[PDB]
Design a protein around this ligand. Structure first.
Ligand SMILES: [Mn+2]
Ligand SMILES: [Mn+2]
Lengths: 295, 26
C-alpha cells in the first residue's frame, strides 16, 4: 500500500528551486518508507557482498540539495548503482528529505542501491545533533523512534568484488575474521566500544604507529601499517570509508591503500571543502567525481 | 540486473583522468 513512485516524484520535484523548498511527505508515507526498507535491511546480509560497477558516497548530513546534485551528476537510479557510507542525518537543514529519498531508492531498487550505517544513524547521537529536533518540529516524537528502529537494522560493512572493504569509520583492533561482522545480530544499538562501534567511529592517523586513542573520545586511530597488514591478511586492495571531512572531497591514506570520501560540499556552511563520489567500473578501476561550488 | 552476491584488481587511471569536476551555482 506504499505509493513509492509518488513519494519519489514529490521528492525530486524541488530540483532547481531557489530557495531550499521542503518536501513534506505524510506521516504514513514516511512510516511506510521506514518499515519497508527495514524489512529489506534484515533480509540482506549485514556484511554486503557487492559487484561492480557502482558509485560510493560519503557523508550527506541532511544536505538534501547536495544529494540531488550527486544523483544529477552521477546518474539518478537506476542509471547507476549506489553504495552510501552513512551519516545521512544531523547538522544539515533537511535530514528528512535526505533519508526519505535514500530509503525510497532502497525500496525501489533493493539490489542496485545500498545504505550502510554511520555513527549518526544512532538514537543517542541524532537526538542531539539535529535529526530529533527536525522530526519533532515537522512531525512528532513517535516518528523519530520509528526511524531509530529502522536505523538499528542497517548493514555495517560492504565488500565490492572481494577487493574493496567499505564502512563508515574504519578498522577495529577486534576484527580478525569477517565472520565477526556477519555474527552481529540486528536490530542493535551502537555500543560505546567494540567491533561495531569501531567500524562506525575509528579514523586513520598518519602520526600513530598501530592503534592509538581517538580525539573524538570514542574508538581508536590506526596507522599506515595497520592498513597494510589488514589488506594483506584478507586479500583486499583498498579500504573505502567516510566519517571525516576532507577539503577535496576525497583523500588517500597510506599510499592509496585507503581513501576517505565526503560527499557534502561546503560542510554545513562551515567549510570550503568539495564533495566527492568514487566511481568504480567493472574492472575495479576507481576514479573520483568531485562536486564543488563555482568561484 | 542486480549486484548483490549470494579475480579483479583495483587500478587507477592516468593522473589526468583521475578527477572529473562538476561546478554548480551556490
Ligand atoms: Mn559525519
Ligand atoms: Mn561519522
Amino acid at each position: 500500500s506504499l505509493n513509492l513512485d509518488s513519494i519519489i516524484g514529490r521528492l525530486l520535484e524541488v530540483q532547481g528551486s531557489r530557495p531550499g523548498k521542503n518536501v513534506q511527505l505524510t506521516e504514513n508515507e514516511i512510516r511506510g518508507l521506514c518499515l519497508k526498507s527495514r524489512e529489506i535491511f534484515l533480509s540482506q546480509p549485514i556484511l554486503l557482498e557487492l559487484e561492480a560497477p557502482l558509485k560510493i558516497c560519503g557523508d550527506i548530513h541532511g544536505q538534501y540539495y547536495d544529494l540531488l546534485r550527486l544523483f544529477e551528476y552521477g546518474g539518478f537510479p537506476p542509471e547507476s548503482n549506489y553504495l552510501f557510507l552513512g551519516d545521512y542525518v544531523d547538522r544539515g537543514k533537511q535530514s528528512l528529505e535526505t533519508i526519505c529519498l535514500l530509503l525510497a531508492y532502497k525500496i525501489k531498487y533493493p539490489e542496485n542501491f545500498f545504505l550502510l550505517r554511520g555513527n549518526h544513524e544512532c538514537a543517542s547521537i541524532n537526538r542531539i545533533y539535529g535529526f530529533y529536533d527536525e522530526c519533532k518540529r515537522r512531525y512528532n516524537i513517535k516518528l523519530w523512534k520509528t526511524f531509530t528502529d529502522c536505523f538499528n537494522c542497517l548493514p555495517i560493512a560492504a565488500i565490492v568484488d572481494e577487493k574493496i572493504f567499505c564502512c563508515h569509520g574504519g578498522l577495529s583492533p577486534d576484527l580478525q575474521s569477517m565472520e565477526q561482522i556477519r555474527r552481529i545480530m540486528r536490530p542493535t544499538d551502537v555500543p560505546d566500544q567494540g567491533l561495531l562501534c569501531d567500524l562506525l567511529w575509528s579514523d586513520p592517523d598518519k602520526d600513530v604507529q598501530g592503534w592509538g586513542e581517538n580525539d573524538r573520545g570514542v574508538s581508536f586511530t590506526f596507522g599506515a601499517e595497520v592498513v597494510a597488514k589488514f589488506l594483506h591478511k584478507h586479500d583486499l586492495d583498498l579500504i573505502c570509508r567516510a566519517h571525516q571531512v576532507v577539503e577535496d572531497g576525497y583523500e588517500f591514506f597510506a599510499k592509496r591503500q585507503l581513501v576517505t570520501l565526503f560527499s557534502a560540499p561546503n560542510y554545513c556552511g562551515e567549510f570550503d571543502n568539495a564533495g566527492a563520489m568514487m566511481s568504480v567500473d567493472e574492472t575495479l578501476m576507481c576514479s573520483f567525481q568531485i562536486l564543488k561550488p563555482a568561484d | 540486473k542486480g549486484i548483490l552476491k549470494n579475480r579483479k584488481t583495483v587500478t587507477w587511471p592516468e593522473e589526468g583522468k583521475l578527477r572529473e569536476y562538476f561546478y554548480f551555482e551556490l
